[PDB]
Design a protein around this ligand. Structure first.
Ligand code: CLA
Ligand code: CLA
Ligand code: CLA
Ligand code: CLA
Ligand code: CLA
Ligand code: CLA
Ligand code: CLA
Ligand code: CLA
Ligand SMILES: CCCCCCCCCCCCCCCCCC(=O)OC[C@H](CO[C@@H]1O[C@H](CO)[C@H](O)[C@H](O)[C@H]1O)OC(=O)CCCCCCCCCCCCCCCCC
Ligand SMILES: CC1=C(/C=C/C(C)=C/C=C/C(C)=C/C=C/C=C(C)/C=C/C=C(C)/C=C/C2=C(C)CCCC2(C)C)C(C)(C)CCC1
Ligand code: SF4
Ligand code: SF4
Ligand SMILES: [Ca+2]
Lengths: 141, 732, 80, 29, 84, 150, 41, 76
């Protein structure tokens, strides 16, 4: 399924904080998290102190993503809300990150394909010497 | 590659300042470099080895050059007892007028440093007499340093690089290192002695200009090939002999008198020429044991395979152990360092007791310096030996190929090894501290008779066996009816018995209850440091807390706060722990050595014998007492020549404590601090015109412990050195 | 970035996925346990290496492991 | 007075060395 | 205040804050005097070499000196312990 | 034994002498019939008794004037080390043996940790005197001394 | 009170034990002071 | 909980003060110090003569043997 897109949606009421974006946002990346609010509410900002949610669609730009999930996770519990966040880049391309597959990651989805799973579990990995000089690493196997 | 460090792509893509830091600390870890092969590994090391030799040759070349150009030496040769050897000249624009006055010593023309390494006594004993001799020697080493670089460059070229199997030719290298590197070198050294050194101690100067039409001996090589070698010991130097002169000079070139030359208080030159000649034989014949290309010799592998005790109490014994060592360079380095660390301490303990250089025993500061020097070198080497041991277990150890052999059984019963080392450390610790504290309380309550002063009669019994008259006992060499005595009767024994029973020298010093306690402290230090290191080695590949500690390597920060918390769980980190204990151990050793000796030189062995039994005595009568002239190096009233040692003394304290910051405070605090400074720079006008190319971050978790330990160590070494030299040289 | 692996020892509890602060893991269908699901590390580029995942695994030995590797801006947790 | 090799080692060599290292380190091939 | 993909620069506060953009307040000729006389030092590389070689030797030159401290001077040296 | 017996050591006598004079000096300020005086005279009498016993029990002394102990095993000084030691090992063994008797009694039970933080004093008092014959641990060693699993 | 007995035998059992030990040791010393050896044999 | 805890704290402070005053009554030279405060050392703790500790009962003046106190209670 296709992800949502945006964006022209308004942002929450805040007064300004020092935890805000920096040059990294300008030249590397920055993130946006978006959500729908039922009421105009007050929430704790990860970067700053306190901000007011705006009823209806809401848009917030944060640096680092983890900030995005930390706020988003808080949004899911505390109040019930549905949220999504994207990676902006500087060119203008945008990238949908979470959820990314319809459903949340906790819940098993059939579309998903495994990455980085070793079927010989255990600590049945080989000694480092065995791969010595082989670009490989024991876990990679 | 793309940018530094280009032996590692993944670390060059680091956008932070960590890339620079880690680029420097991994430059020699060739195995972790990108696209490394076994071929390039052995070639890089081989080349580095030439680079190292080049630096060594260059380093000594510098000392020779400077002693000749800025040192007396010649003045020192005439009056060994009453001339201070000069290290080099001091040119510092920061020097105030007083400092220039206070420092110009040794009859120099300007401010100079006084040497305490003892190269003067060494080169005088060796045969060197004038500055001309020193210069040509400096030239020769500068030359040797060049051909080292030249040879290092040569074997990095494709048509001269050696194959890996060439490096793994063990029996050939051993046959040559024993026979040539040890034997022939030693053989030829005895040659220098009988040609230059010994005649030089008898007034005749034998250099390159006249070592051909001049005999080292009247009978001149006749008796050697005849078989009657005894003629070379026919007429030794007299007991009234004066070094450098013919007064009392003999003709002998090979003796076994034992003991010391009365004037110089050092071993006989004719004793040492004989020593190296005899050495060279066991080494020359010794280097013909293993097999090469002539159809004779031993297979080292086949010997190990054959050494399995029946009844299999050692399992499969030493089978496969040849390849385990020959394939692993870390196992070889570990063995090398351990062996080298032991004979480094052996050197220390023998050069203070049995001085080999003329007039070196009288120089107390040099004797103190050299002993402390080697005991710390030996100590550092010992921890490294126990570092590559672990590294071996992680990087090179092959479990299947070492199945049930002595090496594998170590890991098999590792818990038993570790627990007993823990018991030994706990036993020594509980009682050595216990007895020290008990005695301190007695002194506190003013009742020294209530102390526990255990006589070290076991060691006293050893000294008696050597021939020391004290304690009585009537042991071997201490008893007139002893087969051991009458066997060595009038060979080395008259010289030995005389020397061991001289009250001036450091030849088997008298020991008492105070010596008993410090030795157990020493025993405590050894057992604990080993306990830390071998627990580190045997747990390098895993534990119950971290079953897969391999896969993560020798050095990693941790494994997180889960499972209880796992800080300092890596084998690198117990090394880090062990260095502290090894610094503590060597500290006890050098405190012991230096206090015993300053009281001896002062003629007051009473103060040591009565104050070394309680710990307040050490603080007051050793550290507090001898700090007097040191801390008065500079004063609100004046500055002395000891001012530099006073400055360095605080410097040591500063570096030491600065390291406490990196060791006590950890990373998360500093990372959050820096990112607030990252904010500041960007938001400051005129300053944000300038942007950093590397992202500022806190030092990593491991890096912190390294930086902290280095400070702690540097402070440790620089503080004691400032005290050792000043307190000694201030009094002499 | 860091390296994160999963093992068939996994029981599908899903706790790590719940523990992760940067959305690295997720659950996928499987048939090796009663839960019929197994963890996966499809986005190791966003991982920081705090090991909150490991801290939340109940397998005897961790079924999810995090091998700290090459450092990137994302892994260094830099907001600048 | 040869003792004027001190600044060279004392300062000039260090400055050159630092500048060079700095450049090599910031290089982006 | 705003947020448009169209203009990221502006979105992420890439503003030349205290920038002037004003014409040159410097009197001409004065500028031209400085533009022709400071020109050799503007080439880079060569400035780097001029400062190293120049700064190096200029430093060496002050090797020569008097009331620095080149005088242990007529002062009877002490012995001063066991002697030497 | 390069030392001289304390009975015939001048330094050992000088210490007893010097110590008594120091305590007697303090005796002067307090006058006679007095509490401190009786306290000091009691220390003096305790001092004389101390030195007297050391000499009496044939303890060597060092040039320092203080007794030194011989732990070589020499028969004249078992009192110095060996006799007290055996005494120790008896007690140490006692404590350890009783302590191990408790854990085995506790091990197969309910919540075993409950009796490790809250002592079963009836059980402990039952097991304390078993340490009296703890060196018959030897006979347990001939069979069930230590675990075979490890 | 069963329960009071229960408060006891906690680490108060350690102090009651060590206080008894300290007392015993002190009295022994008061009785036999300054002993550096076992002289009864 | 915190209210009764404060009562517990005060109880200890009162018990603590009870001892300082008591020791100034049974084991001290306060009455001696009261005549010659400028020369006699204030002391309020006597030590039992076991194991050799009696040496800590030094010359504090006033014909008294004990440990010099620096609490300042004598001047209060
Ligand atoms: C071996 C290295 C070294 C050397 C040779 C010097 C030498 C000197 N120092 Mg420095 N210093 C050093 C290391 C060194 N220092 C370190 C590691 C520190 C940190 C602790 C310092 C901290 C320090 C301070 C705080 C001061 C000095 C001062 C001095 C000068 C004192 C002598 C004087 O008064 O004469 C003459 C005095 C002059 C002012 C003559 C000036 C010299 C001319 C201008 C040189 C021309 C500039 C030069 C060419 C540019 C460098 C180019 C080069 C980098 C390529 C002397 C030039 C003092 C000083 O310079 O006075 C202000 C002083 O204040 N030093
Ligand atoms: C024969 C001697 C020998 C050799 C060839 C090696 C070789 C090696 N060691 Mg070993 N080691 C040795 C002895 C030796 N070591 C001894 C004696 C010790 C005990 C101290 C150690 C303890 C040790 C540890 C803990 C480790 C190694 C590691 C390594 C490997 C990487 C080296 C590297 O690139 O880092 C480069 C080193 C530097 C760039 C030096 C910077 C830090 C130094 C200590 C500071 C310098 C001191 C200070 C500045 C003095 C100036 C103070 C001033 C005020 C005067 C390399 C194979 C590492 C390894 O196992 O690979 C992963 C590893 O972590 N070694
Ligand atoms: C490698 C060992 C070594 C060490 C530790 C030293 C250390 C020192 N040297 Mg020596 N030097 C050496 C080798 C060494 N040198 C060699 C092989 C030569 C040629 C024979 C010299 C020639 C030399 C001169 C002329 C001077 C020094 C001086 C000094 C002192 C100040 C540093 C300096 O000016 O740079 C050293 C300059 C060099 C040219 C050395 C480079 C030679 C090789 C490549 C290194 C310092 C104690 C100065 C001094 O005496 O201080 C007052 C001084 O004027 N050195
Ligand atoms: C002076 C400081 C100090 C002391 C006393 C110790 C003591 C010890 N260390 Mg440590 N260590 C230190 C500094 C110190 N270390 C530092 C700075 C580092 C670098 C991080 C280390 C790193 C280190 C490592 C890696 C290891 C040790 C180990 C040990 C133990 C060694 C065995 C032993 O001696 O048994 C005797 C015990 C003692 C000497 C301490 C007992 C203290 C008293 C005497 C106990 C009696 C208490 C008494 C009744 C009073 C009670 C007070 C009351 C409030 C209850 C011992 C407990 C090793 C170990 O664990 O042994 C198995 C171990 O592997 N140390
Ligand atoms: C501000 C204080 C200050 C400063 C700046 C100096 C500076 C100096 N002192 Mg003086 N000193 C001081 C205080 C100071 N001192 C005080 C208070 C005393 C007590 C009175 C002394 C007593 C004293 C004596 C007795 C001597 C000096 C000497 C020297 C000179 C050393 C020359 C040299 O080796 O070159 C360069 C410096 C080094 C080679 C050592 C640096 C070690 C580094 C850390 C090694 C690690 C480098 C690492 C690999 C990184 C490399 C990067 C780099 C290459 C860019 C230098 C000018 C010596 C001298 O005159 O020269 C012959 C001399 O013998 N000082
Ligand atoms: C250093 C190792 C060492 C060891 C392990 C011993 C051990 C012993 N010594 Mg010996 N001793 C030593 C060194 C040593 N000694 C040295 C260097 C000297 C020189 C003086 C002596 C002089 C010496 C004398 C004179 C005697 C001993 C005796 C003994 C035994 C006394 C314990 C006993 O009575 O039985 C165990 C008792 C119970 C278990 C209860 C014991 C076997 C004594 C002996 O011979 O035993 C009969 C004794 O007479 N030793
Ligand atoms: C309140 C102060 C106080 C006083 C005045 C005493 C007085 C005495 N105690 Mg007690 N004691 C006390 C507190 C006190 N104790 C405390 C707080 C404890 C710890 C709980 C003890 C534990 C204790 C023990 C274990 C012993 C004494 C014994 C003694 C008596 C010595 C018997 C004798 O003839 O010597 C000589 C005895 C020879 C065998 C010689 C003596 C009457 C001894 C006694 O009489 O046994 C019942 C005895 O051994 N006391
Ligand atoms: C609150 C703090 C406090 C502190 C730290 C002390 C401390 C002390 N007291 Mg004091 N005491 C206090 C409060 C305090 N007391 C109060 C409030 C009273 C009034 C009831 C007393 C009544 C008192 C008397 C009558 C005696 C002491 C004695 C002692 C000393 C002997 C130690 C001991 O008890 O033996 C062991 C403990 C026990 C046997 C029971 C536990 C010791 C310095 C004794 C002394 O000074 O020796 C000459 C003594 O005779 N105290
Ligand atoms: C917990 C509370 C309840 C538990 C209690 C229940 C048990 C009750 C039993 C109590 C019965 C008391 C028995 C009375 C015994 C008498 C005591 C006595 O004799 O006084 C002590 C006596 C000596 O006593 C002397 O007696 C003389 C005889 O007339 C005089 O009386 C003297 O006054 C007196 O001093 O003997 C000793 O045992 C002291 C010897 C000390 C031994 C120390 C040597 C060790 C030091 C060196 C070794 C170093 C070790 C370190 C090793 C590591 C080195 C690397
Ligand atoms: C004749 C004589 C003698 C002799 C003696 C002897 C016999 C000797 C010895 C000795 C010895 C006996 C020594 C030793 C040692 C040792 C050491 C010092 C160790 C070590 C080590 C290490 C460090 C290791 C490491 C490792 C690991 C851990 C792992 C694996 C690998 C390796 C191995 C590397 C006497 C004196 C009696 C008398 C006189 C003369
Ligand atoms: S947390 Fe551990 S067990 Fe639970 S799913 Fe992730 S991996 Fe499997
Ligand atoms: S480590 Fe932290 S970030 Fe990387 S996966 Fe486990 S939880 Fe997510
Ligand atoms: Ca001697």
């Amino acid at each position: 399924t296709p992800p949502e897109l945006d964006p022209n949606t308004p942002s929450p009421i805040f007064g300004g904080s020092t935890g805000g974006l920096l040059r990294k946002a300008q030249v590397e990346e920055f993130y946006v998290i978006t959500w729908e609010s039922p009421k105009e509410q007050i929430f704790e900002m990860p970067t700053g102190g306190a901000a007011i949610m705006r009823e209806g669609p809401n848009l917030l730009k944060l640096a680092r993503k983890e900030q995005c999930l930390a706020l988003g996770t808080r949004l899911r519990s505390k109040y019930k809300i549905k949220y999504q966040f994207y990676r902006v880049f500087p060119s203008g391309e945008v990238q949908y990150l979470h959820p990314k597959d319809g459903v949340y990651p906790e819940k098993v989805n059939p579309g998903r394909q495994g990455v980085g799973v070793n079927f010989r579990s255990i600590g049945k990995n080989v000694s480092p010497i065995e791969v010595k000089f082989t670009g490989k690493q024991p876990y990679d196997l | 590659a793309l940018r530094l460090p280009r032996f590692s792509q993944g670390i060059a893509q680091d956008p932070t300042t960590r890339r620079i830091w880690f680029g420097i600390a991994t430059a020699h870890d060739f195995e972790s470099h990108d696209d490394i092969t076994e071929g390039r590994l052995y070639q890089n090391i081989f080349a580095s080895h030439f680079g190292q030799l080049a630096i060594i040759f260059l380093w000594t070349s510098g000392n020779l050059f400077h002693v000749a150009w800025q040192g007396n030496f010649e003045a020192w040769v005439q009056d060994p007892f009453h001339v201070r050897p000069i290290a080099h000249a001091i040119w510092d624009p920061h020097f105030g007028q007083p400092a220039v006055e206070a420092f110009t010593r040794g009859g120099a023309l300007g401010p100079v440093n006084i040497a305490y390494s003892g190269v003067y006594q060494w080169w005088y004993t060796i045969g060197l007499r004038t500055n001309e001799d020193l210069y040509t020697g400096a030239i020769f080493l500068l030359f040797l340093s060049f051909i080292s670089l030249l040879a290092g460059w040569l074997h990095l070229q494709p048509k001269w690089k050696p194959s890996v199997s060439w490096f793994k030719n063990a029996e050939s290298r051993l046959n040559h290192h024993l026979s040539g590197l040890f034997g022939v070198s030693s053989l030829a050294w005895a040659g220098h002695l009988v040609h230059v050194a010994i005649p030089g101690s008898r007034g005749e100067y034998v250099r390159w200009n006249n070592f051909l039409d001049v005999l080292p001996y009247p009978q001149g090589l006749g008796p050697l090939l005849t078989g009657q070698w005894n003629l070379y010991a026919q007429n030794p130097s007299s007991s009234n002999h004066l070094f450098g002169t013919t007064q009392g000079a003999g003709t002998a070139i090979l003796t076994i008198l034992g003991g010391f030359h009365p004037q110089t208080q050092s071993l006989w030159l004719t004793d040492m020429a004989h020593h190296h000649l005899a050495i060279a034989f066991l080494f020359l014949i010794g280097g013909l044991m293993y097999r090469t290309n002539f159809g004779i010799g031993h297979s080292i592998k086949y010997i190990l395979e054959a050494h399995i005790p029946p009844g299999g109490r050692l399992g499969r014994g030493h089978k496969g152990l040849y390849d385990t060592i020959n394939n692993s360079i870390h196992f070889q380095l570990g063995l090398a360092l351990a062996s080298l660390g032991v004979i480094t301490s052996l050197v220390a303990q023998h050069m203070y007791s049995l001085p080999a250089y003329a007039f070196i025993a009288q120089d107390f500061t040099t004797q103190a310096a050299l002993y402390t020097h080697h005991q710390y070198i030996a100590g550092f080497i010992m921890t490294g030996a126990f570092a590559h041991g672990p590294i071996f277990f992680i990087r090179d150890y092959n479990p299947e190929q070492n199945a049930d052999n002595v090496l594998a059984r170590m890991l098999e019963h590792k818990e038993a090894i570790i627990s007993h080392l823990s018991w030994a450390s706990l036993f020594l610790g509980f009682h050595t501290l216990g007895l020290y504290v008990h005695n301190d309380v007695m002194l506190a309550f003013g009742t020294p008779e209530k102390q526990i002063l255990i006589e070290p009669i076991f060691a006293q019994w050893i000294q008696s066996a050597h021939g020391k008259t004290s304690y009585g006992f009537d042991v071997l060499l201490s008893s007139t009816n002893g087969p051991a005595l009458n066997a060595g009767r009038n060979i080395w024994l008259p010289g030995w018995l005389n020397a061991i029973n001289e009250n001036s020298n450091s030849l088997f010093l008298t020991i008492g209850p105070g010596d008993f306690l410090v030795h157990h402290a020493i025993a405590l230090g050894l057992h604990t440091t080993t306990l830390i290191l071998v627990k580190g080695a045997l747990d390098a590949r895993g534990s119950k807390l971290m079953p897969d500690k391999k896969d993560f390597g020798y050095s990693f920060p941790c494994d997180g706060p889960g499972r209880g918390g796992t800080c300092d769980i890596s084998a690198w980190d117990d090394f880090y722990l062990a260095v502290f204990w090894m610094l503590n151990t060597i500290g006890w050793v050098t405190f012991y050595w230096h206090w015993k000796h300053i009281t001896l030189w002062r003629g007051n062995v009473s103060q040591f014998n009565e104050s070394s039994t309680y710990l307040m005595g050490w603080l007051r009568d050793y550290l507090w007492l001898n700090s007097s002239q040191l801390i008065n190096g500079y004063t609100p009233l004046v500055c002395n020549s000891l001012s530099v040692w006073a400055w360095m003394f605080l410097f040591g304290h500063l570096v030491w404590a600065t390291g406490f910051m990196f060791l006590i405070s950890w990373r998360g605090y500093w990372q959050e601090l820096i990112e607030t400074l990252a904010w500041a720079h960007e938001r400051t006008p005129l300053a944000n015109l300038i942007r950093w190319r590397d992202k500022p971050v806190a030092l990593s978790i491991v890096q912190a412990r390294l930086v902290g330990l280095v400070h702690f160590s540097v402070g440790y070494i620089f503080t004691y050195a400032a005290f050792l030299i000043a307190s000694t040289s201030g009094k002499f | 970035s860091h390296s994160v692996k999963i093992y068939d020892t996994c029981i599908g509890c899903t706790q790590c996925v719940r523990a992760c602060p940067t959305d690295v893991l997720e659950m996928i269908p499987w048939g090796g346990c009663k839960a019929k699901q197994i963890a996966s590390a499809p986005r190791t580029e966003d991982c920081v290496g705090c090991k909150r995942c490991e801290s939340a695994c109940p397998t005897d030995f961790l079924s999810v492991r995090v091998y700290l590797w090459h450092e990137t801006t994302r892994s260094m947790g830099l907001a600048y | 007075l040869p003792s004027l090799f001190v600044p060279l080692v004392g300062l000039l060599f260090p400055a050159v060395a630092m500048a060079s290292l700095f450049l090599h380190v910031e290089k982006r091939l | 205040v705003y947020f448009d993909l169209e203009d990221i620069g502006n979105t992420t506060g890439q503003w030349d804050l205290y920038g002037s953009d004003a014409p040159s307040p410097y009197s001409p000729l004065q500028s031209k005097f400085f533009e022709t006389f400071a020109a050799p030092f503007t080439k880079r590389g060569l400035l780097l070499k001029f400062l190293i070689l120049g700064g190096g030797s200029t430093l060496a030159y002050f090797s020569t000196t008097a009331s620095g401290d080149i005088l242990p001077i007529v002062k009877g040296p002490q012995l001063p312990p066991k002697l030497g | 034994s390069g030392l001289t017996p304390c009975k015939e050591s001048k330094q050992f006598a000088k210490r007893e002498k010097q110590s008594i004079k120091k305590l007697e000096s303090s005796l002067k300020i307090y006058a006679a019939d007095s509490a401190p005086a009786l306290a000091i005279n009691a220390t003096i009498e305790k001092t004389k008794r101390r030195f007297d016993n050391y000499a009496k029990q044939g303890l060597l002394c060092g040039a320092d004037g203080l007794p030194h102990l011989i732990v070589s095993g020499d028969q004249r000084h078992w009192g110095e080390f060996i006799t007290p030691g055996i005494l120790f090992l008896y007690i140490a063994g006692w404590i350890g043996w009783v302590g191990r008797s408790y854990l085995i009694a506790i091990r197969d039970e309910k919540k075993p940790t409950q009796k490790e933080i809250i002592i079963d004093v009836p059980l402990a008092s039952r097991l304390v005197f078993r340490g009296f014959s703890w060196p018959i641990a030897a006979y347990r060693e001939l069979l069930n001394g230590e675990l075979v699993a490890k | 009170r069963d329960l009071k007995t229960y408060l006891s035998v906690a680490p108060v059992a350690s102090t009651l034990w060590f206080a008894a030990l300290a007392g015993l040791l002190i009295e022994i010393n008061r009785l036999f002071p300054d002993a550096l050896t076992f002289p009864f044999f | 909980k915190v209210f009764s805890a404060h009562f517990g704290q005060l109880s200890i402070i009162f018990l603590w003060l009870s001892g300082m005053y008591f020791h100034g009554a049974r084991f001290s030279n306060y009455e001696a110090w009261l005549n010659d405060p400028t020369h006699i050392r204030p002391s309020a703790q006597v030590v039992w003569p076991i194991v050799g500790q009696e040496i800590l009962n030094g010359d504090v003046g006033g014909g008294f043997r004990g440990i010099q106190i620096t609490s300042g209670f004598f001047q209060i």
